[PDB]
């Protein structure tokens, strides 16, 4: 699915409940490959230091008859990355009730040991992890699609700021 449209979608099915994570990534917008190519990541790549909270939104692109419940959790830095819903539910989390709202937004609090975080891969300024799990399952009736895709979006909050302008790492020139 790399370098096509399919990389912008996360798949969901109507299988029985399982603690295996649906989605996982690290809060490294300027270093994580999945976030470094977003507008937030591209802007951060021009700066060395950054601070502020973020909004992560998820949109459900299934059918109307489809309903379910999902969990989106943020594990703060300094802890083993969540491997199951049981560890995920120990920290900040939000419940996406597919059937009442087609979109769900989660705000990542500024839990940090430093005033500003670095835009490079370093354990000094770990931003934690973000994981997505099932709550019960995706439920669909007869004559309904059983494979449904969700779309993820990332945006900066009102307190976001950057400093120490620098050259990006996604630019090259011959000679």
């Amino acid at each position: 699915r790399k370098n096509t449209m399919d990389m912008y979608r996360v798949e969901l099915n109507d299988a029985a409940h399982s603690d295996t994570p649906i989605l996982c990534f690290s809060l490294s917008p300027a270093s994580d490959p999945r976030l470094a190519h977003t507008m937030l990541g591209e802007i951060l790549n021009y700066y060395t230091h950054w601070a502020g909270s973020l909004k992560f939104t998820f949109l459900f692109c299934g059918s109307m008859m489809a309903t379910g419940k999902l969990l989106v959790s943020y594990a703060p830095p300094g802890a083993e990355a969540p491997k199951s819903r049981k560890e995920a539910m120990l920290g900040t989390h939000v419940i996406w009730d597919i059937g009442l709202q087609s979109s769900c937004t989660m705000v990542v609090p500024w839990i940090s040991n430093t005033t500003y975080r670095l835009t490079i891969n370093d354990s000094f300024t770990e931003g934690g992890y973000i994981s997505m799990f099932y709550q019960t399952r995706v439920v669909v009736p007869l004559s309904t699609p059983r494979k449904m895709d969700i779309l993820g979006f990332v945006s900066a909050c009102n307190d976001f700021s950057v400093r120490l302008l620098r050259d990006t790492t996604h630019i090259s020139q011959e000679a």
Binding site: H17, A66, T67, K69, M89, I95, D97, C104, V139
Partner: protein
């Protein structure tokens, strides 16, 4: 449309059925008429093991604050402090589509005592009367444990007896909610602290019981079998702990 924000946790739903506050009172701290207050550090939602609803399901039961014994700071404070007090916020989620059938009854029972499986009176052990996060199940009939050599010493709840020798129909006397798959896929309950003492031990005494019963059979379209996940998410409220001492390690097995 409901949003439950507590501590560092938030639950958003669009298929709720408002909510009922047990006895009309929200949890409150002890009035005047050294304490430990974890505050938001403990007052947050924790998700218990998701159960499966089938056609043959007879019901499930959990004990509080027993179900939270392993939920991070709340359980740590319960095992570190001799006495404690806290209310509960219970959220039951049961997703279903327009082609599904059935209904769940959620009952908050104070002093939910269950009948044992042995001839000896009240002979259930602590380790079997405190299942923990996994709760337990209801049976369709009473089975007598005749294993004299190695008695099971477990409870023997009966669905139509509510597990306490009382007709299930009267179970609605307790604070309750009804999750009807055709109107709402989730329900919420607010349970204030209930006891004869202002504070009481968090390991010797259980304050509440949550009973989920299949008020109507589960069905889906014309299929011969269907399964519905049921999730139970619980959050302590107005946590108060007292009598700091060495960690308590209850026996298992």
């Amino acid at each position: 449309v409901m949003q439950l924000t507590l501590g560092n946790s938030t639950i958003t739903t669009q298929e709720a059925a408002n909510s009922v506050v047990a006895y009309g009172r929200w949890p409150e701290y002890i009035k005047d008429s050294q304490p430990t207050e974890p505050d938001v550090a403990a007052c947050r939602f924790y998700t218990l093991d998701t159960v499966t609803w089938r056609k043959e399901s007879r019901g499930w039961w959990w004990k509080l604050p027993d179900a939270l014994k392993d939920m991070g700071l709340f359980g740590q404070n319960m095992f570190y402090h001799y006495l404690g007090r806290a209310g509960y916020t219970v959220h039951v989620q049961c997703n279903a589509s327009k082609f599904h059938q059935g209904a769940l009854g959620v009952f908050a029972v104070p002093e939910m005592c269950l009948a044992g499986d042995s001839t000896t009176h009240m002979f259930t052990k602590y380790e079997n009367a405190n299942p923990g996060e996994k709760g337990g199940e209801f049976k369709g009939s009473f089975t007598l444990d005749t294993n004299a050599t190695n008695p099971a010493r477990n409870f023997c709840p009966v669905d139509y007896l509510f597990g306490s020798g009382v007709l299930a129909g009267n179970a609605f006397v307790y604070p309750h909610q009804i999750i009807n798959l055709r109107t709402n896929n989730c329900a919420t309950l607010v349970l204030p602290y209930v006891n004869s003492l202002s504070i009481d031990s968090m390991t010797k005494h259980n304050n509440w019981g949550i009973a989920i019963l299949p008020l109507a059979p589960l069905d889906f379209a014309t299929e011969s079998s269907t399964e519905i996940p049921i999730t139970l998410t619980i959050a302590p409220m107005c946590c108060e702990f007292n009598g700091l001492r060495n960690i308590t390690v209850p026996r298992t097995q």
